[PDB]
Design a protein around this ligand. Structure first.
Ligand SMILES: Cc1onc(-c2ccccc2)c1-c1ccc(S(N)(=O)=O)cc1
Ligand SMILES: [Zn+2]
Length: 257
């Protein structure tokens, strides 16, 4: 009986195996834009993905991860609320069964069709394993997806999904440039949070971009063709793999603009 997004193993059940699920800095959260405050102490955000080198794409039974070689300081996130350098290790998405839901973070309670998470670990800790034992070990850049015009930079990802339909399947995925998934503006909201899936570790500095990227209905429809199940098992479409907004508790969301 492993965790998932169903009625008997979904978000409302996670706290039993992962008590931190009811912690003091859980993610995602609703971003109340009127309550968020501009923070002048924030330095310019730096997203340097020019030397990013992807290696593989994997269906882990919850979502699919595009993995990067993080053995060297190449694709890095710096500036903004961050102290030091954070290295990109992988990115994935959360999406819904319908266009009106799918994102984890919400803006004034509005849910987007999906949400992209670019995961980075603080290099001062040597490896991501050690990083997830630190309150500032991770930085996740979140980007909302709305349905409209297609995102050319996303097509390569969409076209390989047929090769990793079921849980456990992986496929070579080299030379993918994540720069093609970034909106024009880097305006963002930031707050201290957690991983949004078990283990739900509270080691993440969240940086959520205000400007969503547009993807086509056809592109997201292909996301919805993936399976939560492994090969040879009854088909359970990989949809609504998002955790709902959690209590803000003693936290303040800061705006870069
Ligand atoms: C599950 C899991 O197992 N390991 C990780 C992980 C991997 C690399 C760095 C940090 C966490 C994760 C993981 C869990 C949640 C997220 S999220 N949705 O970006 O908060 C991202 C990664
Ligand atoms: Zn995520």
């Amino acid at each position: 009986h492993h965790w998932g997004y169903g009625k008997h193993n979904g978000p409302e059940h996670w706290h039993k195996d992962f008590p931190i699920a009811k912690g003091e800095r859980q993610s995602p959260v609703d971003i109340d834009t009127h309550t968020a405050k501009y923070d002048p102490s924030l330095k310019p955000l730096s997203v340097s993905y020019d030397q990013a080198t992807s290696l593989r794409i994997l269906n882990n039974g919850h979502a699919f991860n595009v993995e990067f070689d993080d053995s060297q300081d190449k694709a890095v996130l710096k500036g903004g609320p961050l102290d030091g350098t954070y290295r990109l290790i992988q990115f994935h998405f959360h999406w819904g069964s319908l266009d009106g839901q799918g994102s984890e973070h919400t803006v004034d309670k509005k849910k987007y069709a999906a949400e992209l998470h670019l995961v980075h670990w603080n290099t001062k800790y040597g490896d991501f394993g050690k990083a997830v034992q630190q309150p500032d070990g991770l930085a996740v850049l979140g980007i909302f997806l709305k349905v409209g015009s297609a995102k050319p930079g996303l097509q390569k990802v969409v076209d390989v999904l047929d090769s990793i339909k079921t849980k456990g399947k992986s496929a070579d995925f080299t030379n993918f440039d994540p720069r093609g998934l970034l909106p024009e503006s880097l305006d963002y909201w930031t707050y201290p949070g957690s991983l949004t899936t078990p283990p739900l570790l509270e080691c993440v500095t969240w940086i959520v971009l205000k400007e969503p990227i547009s993807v086509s209905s056809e592109q997201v429809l292909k996301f919805r063709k993936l399976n939560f199940n492994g090969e040879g098992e009854p088909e359970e479409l990989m949809v609504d793999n998002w955790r709902p907004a959690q209590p803000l508790k003693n936290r303040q969301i800061k705006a870069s603009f």
